[PDB]
Protein backbone atom coordinates (compact mmCIF):
# COMPACT_ATOMS: atom_id res chain seq x y z
CA UNK A 1 0.00 0.00 0.00
CA UNK A 2 1.53 3.30 -1.10
CA UNK A 3 0.86 6.24 1.21
CA UNK A 4 -1.56 8.71 -0.44
CA UNK A 5 0.55 11.86 -0.22
CA UNK A 6 -0.67 12.76 -3.71
CA UNK A 7 -4.07 13.49 -2.18
CA UNK A 8 -2.41 15.77 0.38
CA UNK A 9 0.13 17.64 -1.75
CA UNK A 10 -1.97 17.84 -4.91
CA UNK A 11 -5.45 18.56 -3.48
CA UNK A 12 -7.19 20.98 -5.81
CA UNK A 13 -8.26 23.15 -2.81
CA UNK A 14 -6.38 23.84 0.42
CA UNK A 15 -7.67 24.84 3.84
CA UNK A 16 -7.51 28.32 5.23
CA UNK A 17 -4.73 28.36 7.83
CA UNK A 18 -7.18 29.37 10.53
CA UNK A 19 -9.07 26.15 9.67
CA UNK A 20 -5.95 24.15 8.87
CA UNK A 21 -6.65 20.61 7.68
CA UNK A 22 -5.16 17.44 9.15
CA UNK A 23 -4.98 14.06 7.40
CA UNK A 24 -3.84 10.92 9.21
CA UNK A 25 -1.62 8.70 7.03
CA UNK A 26 -1.39 5.06 8.11
CA UNK A 27 -0.86 1.46 7.04
CA UNK A 28 1.25 2.26 4.01
CA UNK A 29 4.77 2.64 2.63
CA UNK A 30 6.12 6.00 1.47
CA UNK A 31 9.41 7.02 -0.12
CA UNK A 32 10.36 10.33 1.44
CA UNK A 33 13.35 10.88 -0.87
CA UNK A 34 10.95 10.57 -3.81
CA UNK A 35 8.65 12.96 -1.93
CA UNK A 36 11.49 15.43 -1.45
CA UNK A 37 12.07 15.42 -5.23
CA UNK A 38 8.42 14.98 -6.27
CA UNK A 39 8.15 18.73 -6.87
CA UNK A 40 9.92 22.05 -6.56
CA UNK A 41 9.49 23.05 -2.92
CA UNK A 42 10.41 26.56 -1.91
CA UNK A 43 11.07 25.23 1.59
CA UNK A 44 11.48 21.72 2.99
CA UNK A 45 12.81 21.91 6.55
CA UNK A 46 12.92 18.91 8.87
CA UNK A 47 13.35 18.75 12.66
CA UNK A 48 14.54 15.57 14.31
CA UNK A 49 14.32 13.67 11.01
CA UNK A 50 15.33 13.88 7.36
CA UNK A 51 13.92 12.35 4.16
CA UNK A 52 16.76 9.90 3.66
CA UNK A 53 16.52 8.73 7.27
CA UNK A 54 12.72 8.58 7.22
CA UNK A 55 13.16 5.99 4.45
CA UNK A 56 14.64 3.61 7.05
CA UNK A 57 12.12 4.14 9.90
CA UNK A 58 8.61 2.95 10.74
CA UNK A 59 6.15 5.15 12.62
CA UNK A 60 2.73 4.52 14.13
CA UNK A 61 1.14 7.62 12.61
CA UNK A 62 2.07 10.38 10.23
CA UNK A 63 -0.13 13.50 10.28
CA UNK A 64 -0.16 15.83 7.29
CA UNK A 65 -1.51 19.26 8.14
CA UNK A 66 -2.03 21.60 5.22
CA UNK A 67 -3.15 25.16 4.55
CA UNK A 68 -2.36 28.40 2.68
CA UNK A 69 -0.44 31.40 4.13
CA UNK A 70 1.52 34.15 2.41
CA UNK A 71 5.19 33.77 1.46
CA UNK A 72 6.71 35.88 4.21
CA UNK A 73 4.86 33.84 6.87
CA UNK A 74 6.20 30.35 5.97
CA UNK A 75 8.94 31.08 8.53
CA UNK A 76 6.30 31.24 11.29
CA UNK A 77 5.67 27.51 10.63
CA UNK A 78 8.50 26.34 12.89
CA UNK A 79 9.02 25.45 16.54
CA UNK A 80 9.21 28.47 18.83
CA UNK A 81 7.89 31.15 16.46
CA UNK A 82 5.60 34.13 17.15
CA UNK A 83 3.39 36.34 15.01
CA UNK A 84 -0.21 36.26 13.83
CA UNK A 85 -0.01 32.81 12.26
CA UNK A 86 1.95 31.10 15.03
CA UNK A 87 -0.01 32.87 17.79
CA UNK A 88 -3.54 32.61 16.42
CA UNK A 89 -3.75 30.08 13.57
CA UNK A 90 -1.24 27.20 13.55
CA UNK A 91 1.14 26.43 16.37
CA UNK A 92 4.00 23.87 16.31
CA UNK A 93 5.31 22.63 19.65
CA UNK A 94 8.90 23.32 20.69
CA UNK A 95 9.73 19.58 20.42
CA UNK A 96 8.29 19.15 16.91
CA UNK A 97 9.33 16.01 15.01
CA UNK A 98 8.67 16.31 11.31
CA UNK A 99 9.02 18.39 8.20
CA UNK A 100 7.63 21.71 7.03
CA UNK A 101 7.10 21.88 3.29
CA UNK A 102 5.91 24.84 1.24
CA UNK A 103 5.68 26.02 -2.35
CA UNK A 104 4.36 29.02 -4.26
CA UNK A 105 0.72 28.56 -5.27
CA UNK A 106 0.13 31.94 -6.97
CA UNK A 107 -1.21 30.22 -10.13
CA UNK A 108 -3.70 28.14 -8.11
CA UNK A 109 -4.89 30.39 -5.26
CA UNK A 110 -4.82 34.00 -6.56
CA UNK A 111 -7.56 35.71 -8.56
CA UNK A 112 -7.30 38.68 -10.90
CA UNK A 113 -9.44 40.79 -8.62
CA UNK A 114 -8.35 39.18 -5.38
CA UNK A 115 -9.07 36.02 -3.47
CA UNK A 116 -10.58 36.81 -0.08
CA UNK A 117 -11.65 33.25 0.78
CA UNK A 118 -8.22 32.43 2.21
CA UNK A 119 -8.22 33.93 5.72
CA UNK A 120 -6.22 34.06 8.92
CA UNK A 121 -7.22 34.97 12.45
CA UNK A 122 -5.98 38.43 13.43
CA UNK A 123 -6.52 38.37 17.19
CA UNK A 124 -7.51 35.94 19.91
CA UNK A 125 -7.87 36.24 23.67
CA UNK A 126 -4.87 33.95 24.06
CA UNK A 127 -2.32 32.19 21.90
CA UNK A 128 -3.03 28.77 20.40
CA UNK A 129 -1.52 25.81 22.22
CA UNK A 130 0.38 23.45 19.88
CA UNK A 131 -1.90 21.82 17.31
CA UNK A 132 -4.92 23.61 18.85
CA UNK A 133 -7.42 25.00 16.36
CA UNK A 134 -9.86 27.93 16.43
CA UNK A 135 -12.55 27.90 13.73
CA UNK A 136 -14.97 30.39 15.24
CA UNK A 137 -16.30 32.92 12.74
CA UNK A 138 -18.17 34.74 15.49
CA UNK A 139 -18.13 38.55 15.42
CA UNK A 140 -16.47 40.10 18.44
CA UNK A 141 -18.60 42.73 20.14
CA UNK A 142 -16.34 45.53 21.42
CA UNK A 143 -19.14 47.78 22.76
CA UNK A 144 -22.75 47.60 23.88
CA UNK A 145 -24.26 47.79 20.41
CA UNK A 146 -25.29 44.22 19.48
CA UNK A 147 -23.66 42.96 16.29
CA UNK A 148 -26.37 40.40 15.38
CA UNK A 149 -23.68 38.77 13.26
CA UNK A 150 -22.76 41.85 11.17
CA UNK A 151 -19.40 43.61 10.99
CA UNK A 152 -19.36 47.31 11.77
CA UNK A 153 -18.35 49.86 14.35
CA UNK A 154 -17.34 48.06 17.58
CA UNK A 155 -18.08 44.77 15.73
CA UNK A 156 -14.84 43.10 14.60
CA UNK A 157 -14.75 40.07 12.35
CA UNK A 158 -11.74 38.15 13.78
CA UNK A 159 -10.68 36.69 10.42
CA UNK A 160 -8.74 38.78 7.94
CA UNK A 161 -8.88 37.96 4.23
CA UNK A 162 -5.48 37.67 2.55
CA UNK A 163 -6.82 38.86 -0.79
CA UNK A 164 -4.34 37.12 -3.14
CA UNK A 165 -3.74 38.69 -6.54
CA UNK A 166 -1.21 37.46 -9.15
CA UNK A 167 0.41 40.90 -9.21
CA UNK A 168 1.52 40.65 -5.56
CA UNK A 169 5.20 40.62 -4.69
CA UNK A 170 6.60 37.18 -3.87
CA UNK A 171 6.26 37.57 -0.10
CA UNK A 172 2.52 38.27 -0.42
CA UNK A 173 1.75 35.56 -2.91
CA UNK A 174 -0.01 32.50 -1.47
CA UNK A 175 2.04 29.44 -0.47
CA UNK A 176 0.65 25.98 0.12
CA UNK A 177 2.13 24.32 3.19
CA UNK A 178 2.23 20.70 4.32
CA UNK A 179 3.48 19.84 7.80
CA UNK A 180 4.39 16.17 8.28
CA UNK A 181 4.61 15.04 11.87
CA UNK A 182 5.73 11.60 12.99
CA UNK A 183 4.46 9.64 15.96
CA UNK A 184 5.53 6.41 17.64
CA UNK A 185 3.02 4.88 20.06
CA UNK A 186 2.25 1.41 21.34
CA UNK A 187 -0.30 0.93 18.58
CA UNK A 188 -0.86 -1.44 15.62
CA UNK A 189 -0.78 0.95 12.66
CA UNK A 190 2.53 1.43 10.84
CA UNK A 191 3.65 3.99 8.27
CA UNK A 192 7.09 2.97 7.00
CA UNK A 193 9.75 4.17 4.62
CA UNK A 194 10.71 1.71 1.86
CA UNK A 195 13.46 0.07 3.96
CA UNK A 196 11.79 0.04 7.38
Amino acid at each position, epitope marked *: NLCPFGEVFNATRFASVYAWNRKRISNCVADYSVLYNSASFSTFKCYGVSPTKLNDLCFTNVYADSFVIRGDEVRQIAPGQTGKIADYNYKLPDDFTGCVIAWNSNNLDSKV*GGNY*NY*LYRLFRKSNLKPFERDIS*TEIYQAGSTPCN*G*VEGFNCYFPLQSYGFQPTNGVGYQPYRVVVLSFELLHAPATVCGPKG
Partner: antibody
Amino acid sequence: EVQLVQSGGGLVQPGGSLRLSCAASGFTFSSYAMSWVRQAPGKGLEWVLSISGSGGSTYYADSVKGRFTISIDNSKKTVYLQMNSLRAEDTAVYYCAKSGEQQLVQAEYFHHWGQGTLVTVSS
Amino acid sequence: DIQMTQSPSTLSASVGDRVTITCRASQSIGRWLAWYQQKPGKAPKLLIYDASSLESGVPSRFSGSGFGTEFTLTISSLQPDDFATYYCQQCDSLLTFGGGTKLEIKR
Protein backbone atom coordinates in the same frame (compact mmCIF):
# COMPACT_ATOMS: atom_id res chain seq x y z
CA GLU B 1 -31.03 19.09 4.56
CA VAL B 2 -29.99 22.47 3.09
CA GLN B 3 -33.07 24.47 2.12
CA LEU B 4 -33.46 27.88 0.50
CA VAL B 5 -37.05 29.07 0.50
CA GLN B 6 -37.82 32.18 -1.53
CA SER B 7 -40.65 34.61 -0.91
CA GLY B 8 -41.90 37.82 -2.48
CA GLY B 9 -41.82 38.86 -6.11
CA GLY B 10 -44.59 39.46 -8.60
CA LEU B 11 -45.71 42.29 -10.86
CA VAL B 12 -44.26 45.77 -10.32
CA GLN B 13 -44.66 49.01 -12.26
CA PRO B 14 -41.54 50.23 -14.12
CA GLY B 15 -39.35 52.37 -11.90
CA GLY B 16 -40.91 50.71 -8.85
CA SER B 17 -39.41 48.84 -5.93
CA LEU B 18 -39.67 45.27 -4.69
CA ARG B 19 -37.93 43.17 -2.02
CA LEU B 20 -37.28 39.41 -2.25
CA SER B 21 -36.66 37.06 0.67
CA CYS B 22 -34.64 33.86 0.89
CA ALA B 23 -35.15 31.85 4.07
CA ALA B 24 -32.25 29.50 4.81
CA SER B 25 -32.24 26.38 6.97
CA GLY B 26 -30.17 23.26 7.41
CA PHE B 27 -26.70 24.81 7.58
CA THR B 28 -24.72 27.40 9.53
CA PHE B 29 -26.01 30.64 8.05
CA SER B 30 -22.86 32.70 8.62
CA SER B 31 -20.50 30.07 7.20
CA TYR B 32 -21.26 30.76 3.53
CA ALA B 33 -21.34 33.68 1.13
CA MET B 34 -24.88 34.13 -0.25
CA SER B 35 -25.82 35.30 -3.77
CA TRP B 36 -28.63 36.13 -6.19
CA VAL B 37 -28.68 34.96 -9.82
CA ARG B 38 -31.35 35.86 -12.35
CA GLN B 39 -32.57 34.46 -15.66
CA ALA B 40 -34.50 36.72 -18.02
CA PRO B 41 -37.29 35.01 -20.04
CA GLY B 42 -35.65 32.76 -22.61
CA LYS B 43 -32.05 33.82 -21.75
CA GLY B 44 -29.26 32.25 -19.63
CA LEU B 45 -27.95 33.09 -16.18
CA GLU B 46 -26.77 36.43 -14.80
CA TRP B 47 -25.13 36.88 -11.41
CA VAL B 48 -26.29 40.12 -9.84
CA LEU B 49 -25.26 40.37 -6.16
CA SER B 50 -23.44 38.65 -3.27
CA ILE B 51 -22.81 39.13 0.46
CA SER B 52 -20.22 37.48 2.74
CA GLY B 53 -21.09 35.17 5.63
CA SER B 54 -20.40 37.97 8.12
CA GLY B 55 -22.41 40.56 6.15
CA GLY B 56 -19.31 42.74 5.86
CA SER B 57 -18.57 42.38 2.13
CA THR B 58 -21.08 42.97 -0.66
CA TYR B 59 -20.42 42.55 -4.38
CA TYR B 60 -22.60 43.99 -7.14
CA ALA B 61 -22.86 43.54 -10.90
CA ASP B 62 -22.90 46.84 -12.78
CA SER B 63 -26.33 46.27 -14.31
CA VAL B 64 -27.78 46.55 -10.78
CA LYS B 65 -25.13 48.68 -9.04
CA GLY B 66 -26.85 51.57 -7.28
CA ARG B 67 -30.36 50.15 -7.65
CA PHE B 68 -30.24 46.78 -5.87
CA THR B 69 -29.24 46.06 -2.27
CA ILE B 70 -28.45 42.77 -0.52
CA SER B 71 -28.85 42.38 3.22
CA ILE B 72 -28.73 39.84 6.03
CA ASP B 73 -30.92 39.03 9.05
CA ASN B 74 -29.10 36.37 11.02
CA SER B 75 -31.85 35.76 13.57
CA LYS B 76 -34.16 34.83 10.68
CA LYS B 77 -31.40 33.19 8.58
CA THR B 78 -32.65 35.32 5.70
CA VAL B 79 -31.15 37.07 2.69
CA TYR B 80 -32.97 40.09 1.33
CA LEU B 81 -32.71 41.49 -2.19
CA GLN B 82 -34.03 45.07 -2.21
CA MET B 83 -34.68 46.21 -5.78
CA ASN B 84 -35.24 49.92 -6.52
CA SER B 85 -35.73 51.82 -9.81
CA LEU B 86 -36.83 48.62 -11.54
CA ARG B 87 -36.70 48.51 -15.34
CA ALA B 88 -38.26 45.96 -17.70
CA GLU B 89 -34.89 44.32 -18.49
CA ASP B 90 -35.07 43.34 -14.80
CA THR B 91 -37.98 40.99 -15.53
CA ALA B 92 -36.58 37.56 -14.68
CA VAL B 93 -36.78 34.57 -12.41
CA TYR B 94 -34.58 35.41 -9.42
CA TYR B 95 -32.62 32.65 -7.73
CA CYS B 96 -31.20 32.71 -4.25
CA ALA B 97 -28.01 30.61 -4.08
CA LYS B 98 -25.71 29.34 -1.33
CA SER B 99 -21.99 29.02 -1.97
CA GLY B 100 -19.74 26.08 -1.09
CA GLU B 101 -17.22 25.31 1.63
CA GLN B 102 -14.18 27.57 2.01
CA GLN B 103 -16.21 30.37 0.37
CA LEU B 104 -16.84 32.50 3.46
CA VAL B 105 -16.33 35.92 1.88
CA GLN B 106 -16.66 35.67 -1.92
CA ALA B 107 -19.15 33.52 -3.74
CA GLU B 108 -17.13 31.24 -5.98
CA TYR B 109 -19.70 28.63 -7.08
CA PHE B 110 -23.41 28.11 -6.47
CA HIS B 111 -23.87 24.83 -4.61
CA HIS B 112 -27.49 25.26 -3.56
CA TRP B 113 -30.29 27.19 -5.23
CA GLY B 114 -33.61 28.60 -4.19
CA GLN B 115 -36.69 27.63 -6.18
CA GLY B 116 -36.86 30.92 -8.09
CA THR B 117 -39.16 33.95 -8.00
CA LEU B 118 -40.77 35.63 -10.99
CA VAL B 119 -40.36 39.41 -10.97
CA THR B 120 -42.38 40.98 -13.77
CA VAL B 121 -41.76 44.67 -14.47
CA SER B 122 -44.44 46.09 -16.75
CA SER B 123 -46.94 48.93 -17.03
CA ASP C 1 -14.27 41.65 -17.93
CA ILE C 2 -13.73 37.91 -18.50
CA GLN C 3 -16.11 36.46 -21.08
CA MET C 4 -16.97 32.75 -21.26
CA THR C 5 -17.74 31.32 -24.71
CA GLN C 6 -19.21 27.82 -24.84
CA SER C 7 -19.06 25.54 -27.86
CA PRO C 8 -21.00 24.07 -29.52
CA SER C 9 -24.20 26.00 -28.86
CA THR C 10 -26.33 22.86 -29.42
CA LEU C 11 -25.43 19.17 -29.47
CA SER C 12 -27.45 16.14 -30.50
CA ALA C 13 -26.69 12.73 -29.01
CA SER C 14 -28.27 9.42 -28.03
CA VAL C 15 -28.42 7.46 -24.79
CA GLY C 16 -25.11 5.69 -24.27
CA ASP C 17 -23.05 8.20 -26.26
CA ARG C 18 -20.07 10.03 -24.82
CA VAL C 19 -20.33 13.81 -25.12
CA THR C 20 -17.75 16.58 -24.87
CA ILE C 21 -18.70 20.25 -24.53
CA THR C 22 -16.12 23.00 -24.41
CA CYS C 23 -15.89 26.36 -22.62
CA ARG C 24 -13.30 29.00 -23.53
CA ALA C 25 -12.29 31.93 -21.32
CA SER C 26 -11.22 35.28 -22.78
CA GLN C 27 -8.23 35.17 -20.42
CA SER C 28 -6.65 32.57 -18.17
CA ILE C 29 -8.84 31.75 -15.16
CA GLY C 30 -6.64 28.99 -13.76
CA ARG C 31 -8.83 26.47 -11.97
CA TRP C 32 -11.68 29.01 -11.26
CA LEU C 33 -14.39 27.30 -13.28
CA ALA C 34 -17.61 25.38 -12.69
CA TRP C 35 -20.26 23.61 -14.79
CA TYR C 36 -24.03 23.56 -14.20
CA GLN C 37 -27.04 21.74 -15.61
CA GLN C 38 -30.46 23.37 -16.10
CA LYS C 39 -33.76 21.91 -17.19
CA PRO C 40 -36.30 24.41 -18.55
CA GLY C 41 -37.95 26.47 -15.82
CA LYS C 42 -35.97 24.83 -12.98
CA ALA C 43 -33.05 25.95 -10.84
CA PRO C 44 -29.56 25.10 -12.18
CA LYS C 45 -27.58 22.33 -10.46
CA LEU C 46 -23.85 22.41 -9.83
CA LEU C 47 -21.94 19.52 -11.42
CA ILE C 48 -18.19 20.32 -11.41
CA TYR C 49 -16.19 23.08 -9.70
CA ASP C 50 -12.51 24.10 -9.60
CA ALA C 51 -12.35 22.83 -13.23
CA SER C 52 -12.27 19.19 -12.15
CA SER C 53 -13.96 18.60 -8.78
CA LEU C 54 -17.17 16.58 -8.82
CA GLU C 55 -19.89 18.05 -6.63
CA SER C 56 -21.41 15.70 -4.05
CA GLY C 57 -24.14 13.42 -5.34
CA VAL C 58 -23.39 14.10 -8.99
CA PRO C 59 -23.05 10.88 -11.05
CA SER C 60 -19.46 9.96 -11.88
CA ARG C 61 -20.15 9.86 -15.62
CA PHE C 62 -19.63 13.64 -15.35
CA SER C 63 -16.02 14.80 -15.39
CA GLY C 64 -14.29 18.11 -15.96
CA SER C 65 -10.86 19.06 -17.16
CA GLY C 66 -8.85 22.07 -18.20
CA PHE C 67 -6.73 24.78 -16.61
CA GLY C 68 -6.35 28.34 -17.83
CA THR C 69 -8.51 29.13 -20.86
CA GLU C 70 -9.87 25.86 -22.33
CA PHE C 71 -12.24 23.71 -20.27
CA THR C 72 -14.18 20.56 -21.09
CA LEU C 73 -17.12 18.74 -19.56
CA THR C 74 -17.41 15.04 -20.43
CA ILE C 75 -20.40 12.77 -19.89
CA SER C 76 -19.27 9.15 -20.23
CA SER C 77 -22.27 7.10 -21.39
CA LEU C 78 -25.20 9.53 -21.66
CA GLN C 79 -28.55 8.96 -19.94
CA PRO C 80 -32.07 10.44 -20.36
CA ASP C 81 -31.92 12.86 -17.42
CA ASP C 82 -28.76 14.34 -18.95
CA PHE C 83 -30.62 16.06 -21.81
CA ALA C 84 -30.50 19.67 -20.68
CA THR C 85 -28.76 23.00 -21.15
CA TYR C 86 -25.27 23.26 -19.64
CA TYR C 87 -23.49 26.42 -18.47
CA CYS C 88 -19.89 26.94 -17.46
CA GLN C 89 -19.02 29.72 -14.99
CA GLN C 90 -15.86 31.54 -13.86
CA CYS C 91 -15.10 33.19 -10.52
CA ASP C 92 -11.63 34.59 -11.24
CA SER C 93 -12.91 38.13 -11.85
CA LEU C 94 -16.45 38.67 -10.57
CA LEU C 95 -18.86 35.91 -11.64
CA THR C 96 -19.85 35.47 -15.28
CA PHE C 97 -21.49 32.59 -17.14
CA GLY C 98 -21.14 31.18 -20.61
CA GLY C 99 -24.02 31.38 -23.08
CA GLY C 100 -24.81 27.72 -22.57
CA THR C 101 -24.86 24.53 -24.65
CA LYS C 102 -28.15 22.72 -25.25
CA LEU C 103 -27.96 18.91 -25.32
CA GLU C 104 -30.85 17.48 -27.32
CA ILE C 105 -32.08 14.02 -28.33
CA LYS C 106 -30.89 12.72 -31.68
CA ARG C 107 -33.68 11.15 -33.75
